[PDB]
Write a structure and sequence with these properties.
Chains A, B, C: Homotrimer. 3 copies of one chain form a homotrimer. Chain A contains 5 helices and 26 strands. Chain A is an alpha/beta fold. The first copy, chain A, folds into 2 domains: 70 residues, Tetrahydrodipicolinate-N-succinyltransferase, N-terminal domain (Tetrahydrodipicolinate-N-succinyltransferase, Chain A, domain 1, Orthogonal Bundle), CATH 1.10.166.10; 170 residues, UDP N-Acetylglucosamine Acyltransferase, domain 1. The complex binds coenzyme A (COA) (3 copies) and 2-amino-6-oxopimelic acid (3 copies). One 2-amino-6-oxopimelic acid (26P) sits at the interface of chains A and C.
Amino acid sequence: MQQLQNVIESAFERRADITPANVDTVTREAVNQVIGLLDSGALRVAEKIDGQWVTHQWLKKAVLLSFRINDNKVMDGAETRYYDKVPMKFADYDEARFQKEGFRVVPPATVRQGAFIARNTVLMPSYVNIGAYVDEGTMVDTWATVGSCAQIGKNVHLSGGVGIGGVLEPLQANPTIIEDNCFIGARSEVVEGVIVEEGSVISMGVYLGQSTRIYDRETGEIHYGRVPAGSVVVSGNLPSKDGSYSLYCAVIVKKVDAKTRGKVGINELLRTID
Amino acid sequence: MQQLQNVIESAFERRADITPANVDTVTREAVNQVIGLLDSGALRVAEKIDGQWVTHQWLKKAVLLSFRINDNKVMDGAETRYYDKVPMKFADYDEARFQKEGFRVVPPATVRQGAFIARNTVLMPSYVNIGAYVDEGTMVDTWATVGSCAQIGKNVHLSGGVGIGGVLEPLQANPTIIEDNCFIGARSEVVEGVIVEEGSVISMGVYLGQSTRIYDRETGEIHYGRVPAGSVVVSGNLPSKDGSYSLYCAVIVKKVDAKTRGKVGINELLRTID
Amino acid sequence: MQQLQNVIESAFERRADITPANVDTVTREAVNQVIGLLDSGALRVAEKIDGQWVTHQWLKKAVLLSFRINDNKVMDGAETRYYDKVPMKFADYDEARFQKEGFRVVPPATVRQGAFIARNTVLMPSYVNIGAYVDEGTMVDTWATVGSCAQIGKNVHLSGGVGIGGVLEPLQANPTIIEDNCFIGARSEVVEGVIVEEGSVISMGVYLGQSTRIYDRETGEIHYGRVPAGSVVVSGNLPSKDGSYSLYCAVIVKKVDAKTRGKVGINELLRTID
Ligand SMILES: CC(C)(COP(=O)(O)OP(=O)(O)OC[C@H]1O[C@@H](n2cnc3c(N)ncnc32)[C@H](O)[C@@H]1OP(=O)(O)O)[C@@H](O)C(=O)NCCC(=O)NCCS
Ligand SMILES: CC(C)(COP(=O)(O)OP(=O)(O)OC[C@H]1O[C@@H](n2cnc3c(N)ncnc32)[C@H](O)[C@@H]1OP(=O)(O)O)[C@@H](O)C(=O)NCCC(=O)NCCS
Ligand SMILES: CC(C)(COP(=O)(O)OP(=O)(O)OC[C@H]1O[C@@H](n2cnc3c(N)ncnc32)[C@H](O)[C@@H]1OP(=O)(O)O)[C@@H](O)C(=O)NCCC(=O)NCCS
Ligand SMILES: N[C@@H](CCCC(=O)C(=O)O)C(=O)O
Ligand SMILES: N[C@@H](CCCC(=O)C(=O)O)C(=O)O
Ligand SMILES: N[C@@H](CCCC(=O)C(=O)O)C(=O)O
């Protein structure tokens, strides 16, 4: 949408000098419009086109600017109080709306406005930050986090305490992406724009960033930045040249098979009852 | 209780076709009765008999069915709202009740109805899921999670960010069990029905599942599925056959001694003041 | 303050026999006074003097005694209820106060009374326990925890799911300290009085306690208890004598450089807008 993109790209250049007081109504209204569209899933920060994920840098820009244009407001918790500038997505939902949108939200799961949550998902107590997109069938297990602008595929299981990297701080070029049908094991973390290709199974306590060596013991091939579709990855180490010590790495031990599927399947009984 | 077990086992077979609308009052009432009993500690999903933990599969079945028989309801948070089908355990407690039950609940710790919490425990902000049982004296530290149906012994310390596996998704045969007097170090995870025997000390960042090799450096013995009573376990790796790389494992480095006890003791000053 | 320190040190000796009922008004009032001072930053549990961090053991004592002198009270959550004896820091703040104190508090972040939060910090949903001190510019990312009495420097970034050890349980001699300008990578844990010196970068999934070997591959020097200023630390292992297995350790791989700074910088656009 040019009328919106234009204003966004002009404002971004003046980011440092914009404040909630000096911002003109045009930039304010535009940024706000863009956040509502992300919130509804009409727009998304990254999308797959021709077998490639592309990032719309200007939607990322809008997310950033929202922090320069909005002022903080006291939010009343019950026993306590908060002071922040991004509204809560569900603050205004009624049963009819929850009923139509079709996902389950377990207290105290919290989602910021500007994040899209699809039908048939289950959010256990967890956090979904602004700009993120969580597709159909996915479960975000306890204390997991979906970082700003992150893209999560359909039928994905993000285990307890798992973290998917954001793009706000530290600042990142690209969002982190988890394709369809992946299983991410407990306490693992995927950051810095790494792409976990569809049907992959990441074991527990695996840490993937751009500097992480993803070693394929079968081919000897070492990857960086992505997990090839259908891999089973676990933690390991690679020895130094003198064998004096070893350093952490992720190892692709095999391709997903029946034995693997037996341990990571989604439970449909917990999904939306049509 | 046969009158209840019977109905449960009949219904479970039709699990996929049961919905909150078509379920008959008999199955509804039964499942509900069983959840109240788990909630009060009168029944428990697994129990130790003759030096063996046994799982009552039908109590697990009842837990599962509760998700087929109950409908979602809007739950009013303060700044936000939730939409789920399992009530909050403490929603109706008054001071007299908390005073009688004798445990401490630190905001925003949350527990689902159907989980048993014993006297003299302390829940820092954490999550205890349906069907779980948390025995006397235990502390569940910050952002720890006690998964569905998990069994936690007396005087156990579950450190910050620790996860004890559930049985709902992925679906599991048996609950995860932590016997009396264990210490589980920060950020560790214990899943898939592994049993951590009494008096064991699990260090930080240790990940135990059924596939994890638990290597005893002293005997060369490799365990699977359980941590022998009184072990001190830490993270390590075992080399591949070509020494080309190494893969994660848990190592039993020694048996708990005075030096160990010095670092993992429970603080009675924080327990219930009789 | 002698008038306060005296009462504190006398009472501490009788800790086990003090209860909320038998405690005399003098000890009660004193302990309470000391907690208010910690809350405001007028006093702090540890402080750096002459290039050395010193711990005021008696302020730690006061923190402990607060648990012997105060009784539990029901705290009304919205959907649920809690029962604890430490008030919520922000329960009484209004917009004017939040506006003057100058930090951002993202729901559902929670802080206990007795912890100091400085200007220009951002608390994503996280936990800050009693006695802690969080200095200017710092961000406490999602599900991170600042343990009791811990000291966090200025401009520090505590990543998602990071844990900084407390001193209450297990009981510790000294608080854990993170000096200015450090970056602590996701899911890492720093405990047992370890000191991370200024400008250091701790990677993801690094676990540091007093028993952790911090190996400097360049010098062959092995540290214990502290991370030398300006280090980049990552997870690794050191081989056993027979090469039969290896055990976890932290490795200092290099000194912070431009390439490192490129990945761990603070985003000023998210800080307080003056
Ligand atoms: C990866 C996983 C799914 C097992 O898959 P699997 O297909 O059964 O893997 P296998 O048991 O066949 O092992 C295949 C190889 O990988 C290794 N391996 C598998 N999982 C491993 C793990 N977690 N740690 C170390 N090694 C592991 C085996 O040692 C084996 O190596 P080898 O061929 O050299 O001997 C399992 O380890 C896992 O990650 N489970 C997830 C638990 C979880 O997070 N639950 C959520 C709770 S909220
Ligand atoms: C295990 C632990 C308790 C130390 O116990 P300990 O009995 O003092 O162990 P020691 O220091 O004697 O070490 C014994 C052996 O295990 C090793 N070791 C112990 N803890 C280790 C750890 N965390 N990482 C790596 N190695 C460890 C030592 O290297 C030593 O190996 P060696 O005999 O080959 O040289 C400690 O490491 C730990 O896990 N503390 C828990 C911290 C925590 O989670 N706190 C909660 C904050 S919420
Ligand atoms: C440490 C880090 C910042 C990279 O710093 P860097 O200066 O770019 O490090 P480099 O890529 O130059 O690597 C230097 C050495 O350390 C290694 N290394 C760096 N980070 C590593 C990691 N996470 N795991 C394993 N090895 C790592 C490299 O293998 C290399 O070893 P070599 O010299 O023997 O080949 C990055 O790994 C990291 O920790 N990012 C933090 C992500 C995070 O938690 N984000 C927050 C999300 S909430
Ligand atoms: N590492 C997180 C930081 C989020 C910070 C944030 O959302 C805020 O300041 O409100 C992210 O990049 O998503
Ligand atoms: N891994 C968790 C998943 C819990 C899901 C749940 O409780 C729900 O759908 O409400 C568990 O098996 O306990
Ligand atoms: N490991 C934590 C334990 C905190 C316990 C606590 O604060 C309480 O009992 O209220 C700490 O030592 O800070």
